[PDB]
Amino acid sequence: MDYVIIQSMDKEVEEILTDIDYGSFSYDYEKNTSRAISFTVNKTKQNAAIFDLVGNEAILTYQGQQFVIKKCTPKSIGGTISKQITAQHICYTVQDHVQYNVKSGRKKYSIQTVLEFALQDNVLGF
Amino acid sequence: MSDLFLELNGKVHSLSETFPGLSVQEVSRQSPQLSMETAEIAGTDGVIPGMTQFKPFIFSAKCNLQALDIPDYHLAVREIYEFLFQRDSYYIWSDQMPGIRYEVHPKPVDFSRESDRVGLLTIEFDVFKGYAESRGTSLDPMTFEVDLWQMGMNLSNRDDLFYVFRENTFRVYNAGSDRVNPLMRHELDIAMTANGTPTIHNLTTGESFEYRKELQKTDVLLLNNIYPLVNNRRVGKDTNHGIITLEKGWNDFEIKGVTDVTIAFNFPFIYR
């Protein structure tokens, strides 16, 4: 689907974020560098019910991919309320898991061992 | 008969007298360009006005030039262009209202050649101060022989108007249409001689100028615009840096801390 699905931080309500300013919509990708979507939402009658849910830590489903909102900028100019949403791919949220143990010394590792060490006992389902 | 007088380099020149072939048909003055500094809040109705200001305006004079022959016409056109356009602003006034003058800059105006010897012109002078002022200041006496004052200059026909006072409490009448404020690049001079430490209070405006040194009768304190001096020496460090202003109409002034006060006000009237 080409529209955006909004799921709240507590995952209680999941709906469709409508009336998105698609002219401002943009999807940026760069290999090993970034993967994000940015756009602007205006509060209208169609999305007035769920306009309060879109905020920081909410999840946006776009083309089958999940993006966590990391920067929300509500703005009020008279009668128009606009939020500037920037969301990064959920993969980067893996930075919330830290491996405290240290394998001291100089040793020859493969990619498999390092990846297993990094994502050991994950609580985020990675 | 209509004529236009130009004050340039301290000399008064009549436009008709200077150029015999040029005669002023009519004069006119654009209305004051009022402008309120509007501020808009989205979602609300109308605007919130700030402080009303006045933009520069235009004083126009329709005239014609009638020359003897074509070379005379060209020479007269060139001489008129030389005379009107100067490096710096000058003063102008008209026969219809000879008591009010404007500080103006000329504007580009082209001669409209109608025949071989006659040409119509509509001179336009931009007045940039946004207001008109009287030809004479307040120090000039209100006498017939001075030949300066005319009707319509808001002169009060109920009481005498003098601007030299000998007591510590008096009233001064500003006949202009604007509050005289030196901070607004207005012309205002006060010359006071007395004995002691002086303090001038404008009660109606509520302002106060304070000097914190002893003064003798032989020393003159001169406040010109925003500069206080004694014997033409800057003493701003020894004052409270306050400045007095003259409201429209009557202002009640009270002088404290000195005796045998002699205070004189010298300022022009601001019209519009």
Which residues does residue B11 pair with via DSSP β-bridges, in sequence order? B8
The whole-angstrom separation of Cα B227 and Cα B161 is 26
* Resolution in Å, one decimal place: 2.9
Phi/psi of residue B131, nearest 5 degrees: -150, 165
d(CA B51, nearest CA chain A) in Å: 24
Other Cβ atoms less than 10 A from the Cβ of A2: the count is 6
Which residues does residue B134 pair with via DSSP β-bridges, in sequence order? B100
With beta carbons under 8 A apart, name residues in chain A contacting B42: 77-79
Place of tokens 């016409």: B73
C-alpha triplet A66, A71, A75: angle, nearest 5°: 125
Interface of A with B in 24-53 (CB under 8 A): none
The whole-angstrom separation of Cα B107 and Cα B109 is 6
Side chain identity at residue B232, one-letter code: N
Please report the DSSP string for A69-125 in residue order: EEEEEEEEETTEEEEEEEEEEGGGGGGG--------S-----HHHHHHHHTTT-SS-
The whole-angstrom separation of Cα B54 and Cα B128 is 10
With beta carbons under 8 A apart, name residues in chain B contacting A79: 42-43
A77 touches chain B (CB under 8 A): yes
Which residues does residue B228 pair with via DSSP β-bridges, in sequence order? B223
The whole-angstrom separation of Cα B269 and Cα B187 is 9
Nearest to B100 by CA among B250, B268, B246, B267: B268
Spacing of C-alpha B259 from chain mean position: 33
Measured in residues, chain B has a length of 272
**All residues at 6 or more sequence positions from B101 whose CB lies less than 8 Å from its CB, including other chains:** B7, B91, B92, B93, B132, B133, B134, B135
B51 touches chain A (CB under 8 A): no
Place of tokens 């946006």: A60
The whole-angstrom separation of Cα B52 and Cα A72 is 41
Question: A108 with A69: CB under 8 angstroms?
Answer: no
d(CA B38, nearest CA chain A) in Å: 17
Nearest to B56 by CA among B107, B5, B117: B107
Burial of B180 (0-12, 13-18, 19+ CB in 10 A): buried
Please report the DSSP string for chain B in residue order: ---EEEEETTEEEEHHHHSTTEEEEEEEEPPPEEE---B--TTSSS-B----EEE-EEEEEEEEEE-SSHHHHHHHHHHHHHHH--SS-EEEEESSSTTEEEEEEE-----EE-SSSEEEEEEEEEE-SSSEEESS-TTS---GGG----TTS---TTS----EE-SSEEEEEE-SSS-B-GGGT---EEEEEEEEEEEEEETTTTEEEEB-S-B-TTSPEEEETTEEEESS-B-GGGB------B-SEEEEEEEEEEEEEEEEEE---EE-
Nearest to B238 by CA among B199, B210, B207, B203: B210
CA atoms within 13 A on the CB side of A25: 13
CB contact under 8 A, A79 and B41: no
Burial of A85 (0-12, 13-18, 19+ CB in 10 A): buried
Classify B224 as helix, strand or coil. strand
Question: B123 with B61: CB under 8 angstroms?
Answer: yes
The whole-angstrom separation of Cα B31 and Cα B260 is 46
Side chain identity at residue A36, one-letter code: A
Nearest CA in chain A to B42: A78
Burial of B185 (0-12, 13-18, 19+ CB in 10 A): exposed
Question: A62 with A25: CB under 8 angstroms?
Answer: no
Please report the DSSP string for B52-102 in residue order: -EEE-EEEEEEEEEE-SSHHHHHHHHHHHHHHH--SS-EEEEESSSTTEEE
Phi/psi of residue B23, nearest 5 degrees: -130, 135
> What is the count of residue pairs from A and B with beta carbons less than 8 Å apart?
6
Nearest to A88 by CA among A102, A103, A71: A71
Place of tokens 């003098």: B162
d(CA B42, nearest CA chain A) in Å: 4
Token readout for B172 is 């001064």
Token readout for B73 is 């016409």
The whole-angstrom separation of Cα B272 and Cα B131 is 5
Side chain identity at residue B27, one-letter code: V
With beta carbons under 8 A apart, name residues in chain B contacting A75: none
Token readout for B76 is 């007269």
Token readout for B197 is 């430490």
Residue B171: its H or E element: strand B169-174
Other Cβ atoms less than 10 A from the Cβ of B30: the count is 13
The whole-angstrom separation of Cα A82 and Cα B182 is 48
Which residues does residue B6 pair with via DSSP β-bridges, in sequence order? B13, B92
Which residues does residue B191 pair with via DSSP β-bridges, in sequence order? B222, B264
d(CA B36, nearest CA chain A) in Å: 22
Nearest to B245 by CA among B155, B179, B151, B190: B179
Side chain identity at residue B214, one-letter code: E
**All residues at 6 or more sequence positions from B64 whose CB lies less than 8 Å from its CB, including other chains:** B22, B23, B25, B118, B119, B120, B121
Nearest CA in chain B to A77: B42
The whole-angstrom separation of Cα B112 and Cα B62 is 12
With beta carbons under 8 A apart, name residues in chain A contacting B43: 78-79
Token readout for B240 is 């409270």
The whole-angstrom separation of Cα A113 and Cα A115 is 5
The whole-angstrom separation of Cα B214 and Cα B71 is 70
The whole-angstrom separation of Cα B202 and Cα B218 is 25
